[PDB]
Amino acid sequence: MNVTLLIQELIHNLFVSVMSHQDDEGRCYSDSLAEIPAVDPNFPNKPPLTFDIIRKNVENNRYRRLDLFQEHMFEVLERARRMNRTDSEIYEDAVELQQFFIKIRDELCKNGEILLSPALSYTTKHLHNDVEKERKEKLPKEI
Ligand SMILES: [Zn+2]
Known part of the structure; x- marks a missing residue:
């Protein structure tokens, strides 16, 4: 459809960059995350969400807020992390994508003078802290 917002263009650019x-x-x-199930059986009530579903929304300009787009992307990436071993390609690819997402998000927001977005409350440092904690939690279970 037709872009009527700077934020829709930013979201498209961010999605394509990350993918x-x-x-x-x-x-x-992103290839290694292609087969992630849309629903984690451990959390069966969360709506199905996959990169294919998020793409459809992005291309049809359905995201009009950065925070919702980031929420959906982080749902997928965090599912891939939760469901896989720290020594796996999927886990490591998911972390890399999440880190890269934040980097490009911040760059696009700076360029577009996007300052207010609640999505920006979650920083690279928060992600590092959260990933490091998850790695530590997971380690004994992977012996
Ligand atoms: Zn496109």
């Missing part, structure tokens, strides 16, 4: 992010061998990180 296209590649490792040093040109492997797309």
Whole structure:
């Protein structure tokens, strides 16, 4: 559909950037998250959400707020982290994508003079702290 908001353009740019992010061998990180189930059986009441579902919303300009877009993206990435071992490709790709998401989010918001968004309350430092805590929790279970 038709972009009527700066934030829709920003969200599209952010989504494409994150989905296209590649490792040093040109492997797309998002590829390993293609088969993540839409519903974690441990949390069966959360609405189905996948990158395919978020894409459809992004392309049809359905996100009019950064915080909702970030919430959905973080649901998927956090599910991939929860459901997989710290030594796995999926886990590590999910963390990398989440870190990259924050980096590009911040850059686009600076460029667009987006200051107020509640999405910006969750910083790179918060993500580092939260990932480090999860790694520590998970370690003994992976022995
Ligand atoms: Zn597009």
